[model samples]
Target: IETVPVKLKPGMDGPKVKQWPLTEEKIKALVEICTEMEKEGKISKIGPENPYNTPVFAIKKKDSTKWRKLVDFRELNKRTQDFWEVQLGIPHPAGLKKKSVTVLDVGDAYFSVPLDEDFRKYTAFTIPSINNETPGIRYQYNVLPQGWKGSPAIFQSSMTKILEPFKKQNPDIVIYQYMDDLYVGSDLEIGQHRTKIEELRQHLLRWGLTTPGYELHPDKWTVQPIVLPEKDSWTVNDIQKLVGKLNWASQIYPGIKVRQLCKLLRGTKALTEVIPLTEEAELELAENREILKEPVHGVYYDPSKDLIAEIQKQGQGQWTYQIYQEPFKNLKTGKYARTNDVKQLTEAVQKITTESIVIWGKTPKFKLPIQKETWETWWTEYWQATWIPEWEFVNTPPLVKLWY
Candidate 1:
């Protein structure tokens, strides 16, 4: 078990030195973890001294015919996916999962900050009360207990038990439990997705848990499959465990692209040494960083209300300013804050791009496939139609619908 020395913070409330000191259970897990590593021959006991950093070894094969290999699964440092995660795909879910297919993407689940006093109870949100019952309770909050080290094991074991029989019948149903998000998948259309979601929801409801659905992707979720691009295939960026597969021990990884990824990682690797960093090389590292900063809502830094108000005053009716400039009211050049919750953010994004309520307010007389005469004069017009009904504005003559 590797141990990280942590300085107690000035006002660190929970995990007090006296009340909740490191217990025998913690030490046992720690030793067990290191013992497992040693058993795997991952580290050699060269000396009984504290090492500043973890060490790994790479060996060369005596026979040159074949080569030795290594894998380094440490890639929370990439730059590509921030570009892609924000890509506006037609808001929809590709539902091409087979009967065996099970996908899971858990949204931000419940977690309460455990304040000082009842650290043993963890928090109101994490621990369940007496007389707890049902499916909702199953998905409800988790209290930190059973040796704080065993929570993941304890919770996941229970979750697996609940999902096992279903998965037995369907090998494709995956149940991923990222701390906040619980991603689950299926291979049918929106109906199937909805059904699975409902089933899970019912389970959660019984257990006393629920999630929000503000995304259009959920609104218009279909049972189609998303076509994955070749470049987006599973890479060292997606799975940390597979980093060693990329070792390229003796022979270089075949492509200029992989080499490029490695080089970028090395170049700006210094920046990554800091906590909470972005803008690095490769897609995987960037993606990993995003994963670490979950509850996707936290991705955006909230602007001060005063600054937001200022942007609103300056933006006026211009879609560009309201959509882009306005959001930057309190945004420092180096930061990005989600303007709203996922749904609010999505709606806001749409508001900026399309003819909005404000546009419609001025064009009330215009109907669908609006006449050119109704198009704003400031807009470069290309439409022409001679079919508009005879109608006149306040004092103007019945105008013909034509381009400006």
Candidate 2:
């Protein structure tokens, strides 16, 4: 159950600091939290002689009622060396298509990791005086402080190492770790999925990493609808915040257009500058939200199936292509079908005519019938052959059918 203490890089040091001013309510919350944390042995009162100190503050939590104490370790963090080397690739929730997912959020994750004793002084902070007459009380974190730069990386590595054995034991179960949030997913039925989730929880418990509880989502992963601001005009900050949310939504719902709203921010110099919400922006925002309202059934990628690309010539010397995996019969619909568009590309003939010929996907060598010798020669020299797979090319109309 013992966790490793965080070690700072050698030669890292900082000077003593004071706490920032806080409102009356926040001061009360800070004092209450410090007392509770002190009782739990997470932090301890330190002497004024402590060489290093950092400022601390309290911010309202998501519920807006409870407050979370935060240390402003900016100065100390700048002096500390970063040890965040291991980068785990975060798998998009959509990629886990049709699987049951359980997300385990570690409680008091940072506090569970102890700070190296010698480095505790570097995280010392002063608590605001309860009365104007009393001097601020000095306290230092015995465990990893929330605002330290290395806490997340340090905690991630620790948790990953602890769960390594569990992962090895159950290779069939998909486990994704993003800092303290561990996601366990499986294609098994709900009953069996619950069993696997319980097993993971047991494993986590053995390492002293406790979770309030796990959230089970039996349905496939999908984007949640975002609530947009209801006003006619918005400040630059409002647009930026909304755009940020949309950007995250775009990752889950691929092909959801966010560029229209992003364009509103173009040439915006100040966050306070108010901009009128145009029709296009409102429409695009609503469209994105509507698309995210329902669960999107994603096509599971199978390497065994053939990849198909449908290319169509558009007027004005442009061509559009959509790629998909070979269609399979749906269990429910009982009809052969393709799921979603896998990839898309659009090319302008004028650009291709002047620039070096570039092709996507696999290429095949083929000769085009000469109708216009000059244009045919250019095509012959630059176009090695059809970019689509040979099988698809045969099923599709011949490239010679395209009139330049």
Candidate 3:
């Protein structure tokens, strides 16, 4: 059994729960995942039974058919205080019109933040037969765990400070963050976009969110798969993991890809590194290429079909529209087709290109598109279409919709 150094909270005896039943295969899987976590300095072993313990369980992913290990923190969260601050989501137009868009996810976001000695026991748990009939082997989180009440706030506070310096550097630049997912965008003519994104990436790495070569979490990188041109071939297992991540993300956000995906994630070497892309590059083999952009859609709206009258009839006081920016490009079809089914989307190499929302405000929730324009134009357009002149003279507050 392995263990990590931790700071346990004082006075509070952590609760303990009975080990849940598990099969031999499940036990094997738990052991492997825990070992990986330990190798990455994420978790450690416990000696005597800790007072604070939460049962760990596995969640079966619908699309990928993989079990996602999780801690039952519902009881823990109930008593814990909320530390996460509310931050605005990614700006709708920010990435759509940019020459290059970078979406980043901190692998094991909460886990990345190390636990203060006082709070370690709060995450203690014992695994039933986690290792070959070894019952009641105890372990605890040396880092923050998701569903911990204060975990969100803890990550938010640190992340906010980490981003503060960069935010001051470019006040006009649009950068949005929701928890761990970050979106960075720049206009085509902007030369500093790449550098700024790199700087941000460095900040994330410095804060202990991700590793240099491979990203940890598969569920958070829920974007369109980047179709890299294959020059070599790697193992089937490598591609299988690659496809697994894609399949998982597709369930989170439907219609995430538009092009054939099989041609993607293939090469002499498999995509081992899940780093966010600054731009497309071939297998110099220095880095791993994975998915890039995520399709962001808030709601479905058709300007020709759904209008304020009809929308209001449905009891919507706010007529905020969704921004549909297809993240993938279909080389064979030459048009974007949305699908929640990832297995069906993988056929060939699909290029991810920069495309503007030409029909902005035409579909789902008439909101802003990536023209680098103001909310003023959107507001003005709405009133003009509805013939609400009197309302136009009144300055109404603008509502911004976020894609989380």
Q: Count the backbone clashes (under 3 Å) in each candidate.
A: 45, 0, 27
Q: What's the distance in Å from true for residue 257, model 2?
A: 18
Off by over 4 Å in 2: 1-18, 57-67, 72-78, 86-103, 107-114, 130-133, 147-161, 174-180, 183-195, 213-404
**TM-score of model 1 (CA atoms):** 0.24
What ranking emerges by lDDT with the best candidate at the front?
A: 2, 3, 1
What TM value does model 2 have?
0.43
Best by lDDT: 2
Per-residue error for 164 in candidate 1, Å, reads 1.9
Model 2: colliding residue pairs? none
Assess every candidate by TM-score: 0.24, 0.43, 0.38
Q: lDDT scores for all predictions?
A: 0.27, 0.54, 0.43
Candidate 3 or 2, higher lDDT: 2
What residue runs in model 3 are displaced by over 4 Å at the alpha carbon?
A: 1-26, 36-42, 57-69, 82-103, 108-114, 130-133, 146-149, 173-180, 183-199, 206-404
